[PDB]
Amino acid sequence: LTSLIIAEDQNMLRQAMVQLIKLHGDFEILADTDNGLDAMKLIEEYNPNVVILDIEMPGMTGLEVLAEIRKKHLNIKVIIVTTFKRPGYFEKAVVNDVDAYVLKERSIEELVETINKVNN
Ligand code: NA
Secondary structure: OOOEEEEOOOOOHHHHHHHHHHHHHEEEEEEEEOOOHHHHHHHHHHHOOEEEEEOOOOOOOHHHHHHHHOOOOOEEEEEEOOOOOOHHHHHHHHHOOOOEEEEOOOOHHHHHHHHHHHOO
């Protein structure tokens, strides 16, 4: 299947994504965490095909994690998934070559469609 790491600040939503993403699509979750520094280490350890990153997290924000994955040219699709409607955050994701930016206005079903489009 497609491997994923999920880094998300909120435990309730994070555990929900780990469970529902596996049921809504053809994915294996290698690791999940609420800390961006933790995520960056897991990412280098496991090399997942795709990562899902919240923005505002302790350690490293999702945007700093995205920036580092790109600096290092890792073969990894990156989806940011956030509540933030602020214009600044979307522009920072785009300039850093994010593969998709998904608002939490979308369902996990839509997020899965997005991962599939991105990974094809
Ligand atoms: Na599945």
